[PDB]
Amino acid sequence: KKDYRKKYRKYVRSRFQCIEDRNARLGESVSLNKRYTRLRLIKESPIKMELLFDPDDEHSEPVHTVVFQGAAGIGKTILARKMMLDWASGTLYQDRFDYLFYIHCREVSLVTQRSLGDLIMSCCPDPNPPIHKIVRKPSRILFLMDGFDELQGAFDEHIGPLCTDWQKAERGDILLSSLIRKKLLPEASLLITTRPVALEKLQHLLDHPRHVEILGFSEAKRKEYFFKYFSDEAQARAAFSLIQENEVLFTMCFIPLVCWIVCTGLKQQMESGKSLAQTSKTTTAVYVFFLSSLLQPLCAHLWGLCSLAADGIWNQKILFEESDLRNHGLQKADVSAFLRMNLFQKEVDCEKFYSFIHMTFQEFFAAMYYLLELPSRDVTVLLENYGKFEKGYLIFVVRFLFGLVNQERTSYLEKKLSCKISQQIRLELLKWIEVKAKAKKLQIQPSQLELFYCLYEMQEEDFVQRAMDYFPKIEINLSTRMDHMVSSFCIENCHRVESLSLGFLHNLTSSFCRGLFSVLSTSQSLTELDLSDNSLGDPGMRVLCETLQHPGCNIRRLWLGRCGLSHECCFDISLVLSSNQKLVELDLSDNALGDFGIRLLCVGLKHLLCNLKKLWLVSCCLTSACCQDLASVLSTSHSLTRLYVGENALGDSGVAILCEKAKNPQCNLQKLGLVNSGLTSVCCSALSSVLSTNQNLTHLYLRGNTLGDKGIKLLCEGLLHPDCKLQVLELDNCNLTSHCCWDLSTLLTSSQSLRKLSLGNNDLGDLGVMMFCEVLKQQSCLLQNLGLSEMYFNYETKSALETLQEEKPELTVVFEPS
Ligand SMILES: Nc1ncnc2c1ncn2[C@@H]1O[C@H](COP(=O)(O)OP(=O)(O)OP(=O)(O)O)[C@@H](O)[C@H]1O
Ligand SMILES: CN1CCC[C@@H](Nc2ccc(-c3ccc(C(F)(F)F)cc3O)nn2)C1
């Protein structure tokens, strides 16, 4: 008769027109979902809400599963609700999906046994919708699974009895697993929202997902929020300015939830005729401020309130009934008070439960429970469950304990916490950090950036400085401004760190990290800085070099691998080399520092007081043209001993240039990395000359070249020289065969300095190895790995090599492949 899908769209539009779908909105004002402030969405590249499920750029491969990850408060629910409304309004997926089914994971039970009847309860009031009709057909239906991490109770990601078929009733965990794994109603689309931490389990269900990260408000979007929140423009501007002046809070406000909390606080202060001051610095300070302002205008119910929250965390319960409120001393009068002020919500769409306005608030109270003046009240058992899904990870519960357990405390509710307990907890928290600071990642989590968000929450230097004494090595990945703010605070107070590794994720290409590099330059203990494999391009190097010229820098080793640097950055690197007398090791591998960049770099390398000892220029798009400048550096440098230039186009002519100066007996070169440089036997006479004259050269790496047997003979003329002191010779993958074995054998029985000789991916043959075995027994000085890896031989040869290892144990390592 009529198309029932129209009624469903009408239902969705009337239901999702508001932000919460719940009452107690500070007098239940209309929240107006049209206020939605745009969130930043990055595909793992910026994307639009439309075309989200389109096939990718090759093979036209379709996507069924899309996962949206983000922090608590970033807007995963407001965004998923927005999609429901936009679709129902005909502004999104108009010709892609016939239905959108919104699944609220805080309502789904992992214990209760049910068929796929959620499709009934999640839609119109009609108790008997046409489930068996065309709505049963996949490819036109998208499910929105909102809050994977909010599922209450243990969840097993590995299930034997997957139980497909929507008609069969089964446990919620099994049912969700089959839906996520696309075994139940396959070829349907599924969108999942989750906190990044819960991906530890979800990753096993998804198989081949598309991932999108949700980022909060840009500075422009923060302003829009305030202007939309406050209908009075004069107030909106005053509020914005007050916050803008608070750099720390402004930074935190990238999270929509933080903006909401702050705005609500200011609104209440306006109504009461207060100063409107907002001086919060930490997440805890913001939450305490908010709750205090609401409780001030009652406060004797804090115990029951906190106890309720704590129970919910331990028993995995978010939704409460009147019985649960009464069981904790909450009954009607105070409950209503907590609806007038926005602490609880009841739900308005023909439902009656109670819950906290946000999971972070429930966790806040659950944390405060431990400090007041009944699951445990033992912080030890709490911490033991930190990394577990089963308890909701307790990330904010612990993070808030750090903030609450602080000597720098004030009045209003906070004063009701016990000082004796606070000290007991404080000490346990220090022990917890010491233990977690020394651990393997293993996807478990108090991840160093996380221990730093914990430390940031308490500004007490006496605590933080001691906590930071457990981090001799810091490895972190920063994606947002808040990550930098937190990292800088902790590093500024760390006097033990010797090695620091900083990753940068899509927000370098800019100066975002300037406020962190300015910290590193004042560190006295830091000696090694690793900034590899991140987009620290030219402008980023300029900032770093500015800080490396600081008189107290003390950085000795700097690793700059795939940083996206070009020749211009060498100008600034040179300036550092000409001033900073402490820098010893510099790795510039895998950059675009072509011949010109080296010419510039060499200006610093040839400078008096440049003490650089080790330089890596591997895969830097170099060719023979630059060898003239490198040769000049080798000729005069008093400190450069290690030079690695492989994986470049330094052909025979380039090597001959370097050799012309390297052969000088006064040259300090000790290790030469002429690896995958396209050398042939033509240049071996040059290398031979160097070996014969330069007694300081101890390591030569020629693997990947094509020297052949002729090259070996030429090198042997030098290697067999009485004044040659080479200790390590690597000739892997040099296109050598059995015809060179006579000369290699001669080397083994004549060289006095050789200790390690490495042959590898080449057709040495069985005759070759057997001949070596027969001479390696005759008081050979060779002690180290003989190589012969990635080589295959007959049974006799394998036995002979094993025999040699037992008979002549001085040659400890042969390293056969089998
Ligand atoms: N785009 C937006 N515009 C304005 N406010 C927003 C937006 N996104 C989120 N908020 C604010 O954030 C608060 C809660 O955020 P939200 O509940 O979406 O966080 P979440 O952790 O993603 O949710 P859930 O835990 O339910 O998945 C709301 O009170 C709302 O005011
Ligand atoms: C688990 N941990 C690993 C290391 C990186 C860290 N990243 C974030 C991102 C965001 C927030 C965050 C902080 C305060 C708030 C509040 F104020 F709204 F409560 C809401 C948040 O979402 N906290 N940590 C997560």
Cα gap 102→119, rounded to integer Å: 9
**Terminal Cα-to-Cα distance of the chain (whole angstroms):** 75
Tell me the CA–centroid distance for residue 383 and ligand 2, in Å.
18
| Complete DSSP assignment for 422-445 | HHHHHHHHHHHHHHHTS---TT-S
Structure determined via:
cryo-EM
To which residue do tokens 């299930």 refer? 159
Q: How many CB atoms lie within 10 A of CB 599?
A: 16
Residue 63, φ and ψ in degrees, nearest 5 = -120, 135
Cα(100)–Cα(119) distance, integer angstroms: 10
Which residues lie closer than 8 Å to 34 by C-beta, 6 or more apart?
A: none
**What is the gyration radius of the CA atoms in the chain, in angstroms?**
34
**Count of Cβ atoms closer than 10 Å to residue 337 Cβ:** 16
Q: Is 198 in the pocket of ligand 2 (CB under 6 A)?
A: no
Burial of 420 (0-12, 13-18, 19+ CB in 10 A): exposed
Where is 143: in which H helix or E strand? strand 141-146
CA 576, CA 548: separation in Å to the nearest integer?
6
* For the CA of 25, the nearest ligand: 1
Q: Which residues contact 87 (CB under 8 A, 6 or more apart)?
A: 9, 12, 93, 94, 97, 100
Contact (CB, 8 A) for 726 and 691: yes
Could you tell me the two tokens for 216?
């909060």
478 close to ligand 2 (CB < 6 Angstrom): no
Q: 536 and 566 in contact (C-beta within 8 Å)?
A: no
Kind of pairing, strands 557-559 and 585-587? parallel
Buried b (16+ CB within 10 A) or exposed e, 491-511: bbbbeebebbbbebeeebeee
- For residue 640, how many C-alpha atoms fall within 13 Å in the half-sphere facing its CB? 24
Q: Two tokens at 778? A: 């005759």
Bridge partners of 344? 356
Tokens of 472: 């001799």
Query: Are 502 and 535 spatial neighbours (Cβ–Cβ below 8 Å)?
Result: no
Largest CA distance in the chain: 103
Question: At residue 302, what is the residue type?
Answer: L
* C-alpha 83 to ligand 1 mean position (Å): 13
Tokens of 754: 């050789």
DSSP string, 50-110: TTTTS--SSTT----EEEEE--TTSSHHHHHHHHHHHHHTTSSSTTT-SEEEEEETTT-BS
Q: CB-based burial of residue 275 (10 Å sphere; 0-12 exposed, 13-18 middle, 19+ buried)?
A: exposed
Write down the H helix ranges in 506-664: 514-520, 538-548, 569-577, 595-605, 627-636, 652-662
Torsion sign across C-alpha atoms 734, 738, 742, 748: positive
* C-alpha angle 230-232-234 in degrees, rounded to nearest 5: 110
Rounded-to-integer distance, Cα 352 and Cα 333, Å: 17
Give the closest residue to 740 by CA, choosing from 725, 757, 723: 757
Instruction: Yes or no: say if 194 and 148 are a contact pair by the CB < 8 Å rule.
Output: yes
Q: What's the CA gap between 144 and 547, in Å, rounded?
A: 48
Going by their DSSP bridges, the two strands 355-356 and 344-345 should be labelled as: antiparallel
Render 297-339 in DSSP notation, one character per residue: --GGGHHHHHHHHHHHHHTT---B-HHHHHTTT--THHHHHHH
Q: Which residues pair with 502 in a beta bridge?
A: 476
Polymer length of the chain: 818
Closest CA to 394 of 406, 376, 412, 407: 376
The three-state secondary structure class of 559 is: strand
| The two three-digit tokens of residue 141, written as one number | 């239906």
Using the mean position of ligand 2's atoms as its centre, give its distance from the Cα of residue 388 in Å. 17
Q: How far apart are CA 518 and CA 513, in angstroms?
A: 9
Report how far ligand 2's centroid is from the alpha carbon of 485 (Å): 13
Query: Sign of torsion, CA 763 767 770 774?
Result: negative
Residue 147 token pair: 């809050």
Sheet (strand 99-104) strand order: 40-43, 210-215, 65-69, 189-194, 141-146, 99-104
The 10 Å Cβ neighbour count of residue 232 is: 11
Using alpha carbons, select from 195, 291, 295, 289 the residue that is nearest to residue 249.
289
β pairing state of 728-731 and 671-673: unpaired
3-state class of 35 per DSSP? helix
Rounded distance, CA 510 to CA 536, Å? 8
Q: How many CB atoms lie within 10 A of CB 681?
A: 19
Residue 279 burial (C-beta neighbours within 10 Å; 0-12, 13-18, 19+):
exposed
Strand segments (E) across 617-769: 642-644, 671-673, 699-701, 728-731, 756-759
Grouping H, G, I as helix, E, B as strand and the rest as coil, residue 620 is: coil
> Measured between alpha carbons, how far is 794 from 297 in angstroms, rounded to an integer?
90
Distance CA 811, CA 170 (A): 65
Q: Are strands 210-215 and 40-43 parallel, antiparallel or unpaired?
A: antiparallel
Q: Which CATH number fits domain 1-215: 3.40.50.300, 3.40.50.740, 3.30.1490.20, 3.10.20.340?
A: 3.40.50.300
- CB of residue 448 inside a 6 A radius of ligand 2: no
Nearest to 296 by CA among 268, 335, 267, 261: 268
* Strands, E assignment, 227-286: none
Sequence-separated (6 or more) residues with CB below 8 Å from residue 120:
126, 127, 128, 129, 131
- Cβ proximity of 515 and 488 under 8 Å: yes
Query: Exposure pattern of 452-484 as b/e (b: 16+ CB <10 Å)?
Result: bbbbbbbbeeebbbebbbbbeebebebbbbbbb
**Token pair recorded at residue 80:** 């998923």
Closest to 426 (Cα-Cα) out of 462, 385, 469, 450: 462
Breaks after residues in the chain, judged by C–N over 2.5 Å: 44, 297, 373, 507
Q: Which ligand is nearest to the CA of 318?
A: 1
At 261, which helix (H) or strand (E)? helix 256-271
Pairwise CA distance, residues 624 & 148, whole Å = 58
Joined together, the tokens standing for residue 152 give 């209450």
Q: Which ligand 2 atom is nearest residue 393's CA?
A: 1
CA distance linking residue 651 with residue 630, whole number of Å = 14
Our answer on whether the CB atom of 75 is closer than 6 Å to any ligand 1 atom is yes
**Using the 8-state DSSP alphabet, how is residue 42 labeled?**
E
CA separation for the pair 458, 454 (Å, rounded) = 7
Q: Which residue shows structure tokens 């050598």?
A: 736
Tokens of 734: 């040099």
Task: Evaluate the CA torsion angle 558, 561, 567, 569 in order and state its sign.
Answer: negative
Which residue type does 440 have? K
| CB neighbour list of residue 344: distance below 8 Å, 6 or more residues apart | 24, 335, 338, 354, 355, 356, 357
| Pairing of the two strands 756-759 and 210-215 | unpaired
Interaxial angle between packed helices 481-492 and 449-456, expressed in degrees from 0 to 180 and rounded to the nearest 10: 80
Q: Tokens 């001086």 map to which residue?
A: 279
Testing ligand 2's pocket by substitution, the residue of 200, 399, 453, 454 carrying the most ligand atoms inside 8 A of its CB is 453
Residue among 257, 344, 355 whose CB has most ligand 1 atoms within 8 A, to mutate: 257
User: Cβ(453) to ligand 2 under 6 A?
Assistant: yes
> What pairs with residue 671 in β-bridges?
642, 699
Q: Is 82 annotated as a binding residue?
A: no
Q: What own/partner pairs with CB < 8 Å and gap ≥ 24 does 131-137 have?
A: 134/98, 135/98, 135/99, 136/166, 136/185
Distance between CA atoms of 703 and 731, rounded to whole angstroms?
5
Strand order in the sheet with 473-478: 473-478, 499-504, 528-530, 557-559, 585-587, 614-616, 642-644, 671-673, 699-701, 728-731, 756-759
CA nearest ligand 1 atom 18, residue = 75
- Three-class SS of residue 644? strand
Report whether residue 76 contacts ligand 1, using a CB cutoff of 6 Å. Answer: yes
Tokens of 62: 């379709």
Q: Resolution reached, in Å?
A: 2.9
Residue whose tokens read 């391009």 = 537
Q: For residues 114 and 172, is the Cβ–Cβ distance under 8 A?
A: yes
Q: State the distance from the centre of ligand 2 to the C-alpha of 197, rounded, in angstroms.
A: 11
CA atoms within 13 A on the CB side of 616: 17
Residue 451 to residues 410, 438, 445, 529, Cα–Cα distance (Å): 25, 12, 9, 21
Taking the alpha carbons of 50, 56, 59, 62 in that order, is the dihedral positive or negative?
negative
Judge residue 45's burial from the number of C-beta atoms within 10 Å of its C-beta, 0-12 exposed, 13-18 middle, 19 or more buried. Answer: exposed
Kind plus residue range of the DSSP H or E element containing 225: helix 219-229
Contact by Cβ (8 Å): 152, 317? yes
Q: Measured in angstroms, how far is the CA atom of residue 507 from the centroid of ligand 1?
A: 20
Q: CA 807 to CA 766: how far, in whole Å?
A: 20
Q: How far apart are CA 541 and CA 520, in angstroms?
A: 14
Check pocket membership of 260 for ligand 1, CB cut-off 6 A. yes
Note whether 560 and 591 are within 8 A (CB): yes
Q: Phi and psi dihedrals of 754, rounded to 5?
A: -60, 130
- CA distances in angstroms from 92 to 48, 84, 700, 701, 791, listed in the order given: 11, 9, 64, 60, 60
- Among the bound ligands, name the one nearest to the CA of residue 256: 1
CB burial of residue 338 (10 Å; 0-12, 13-18, 19+) = buried
> What's the DSSP call for residue 38?
P
H or E stretch at 228: helix 219-229
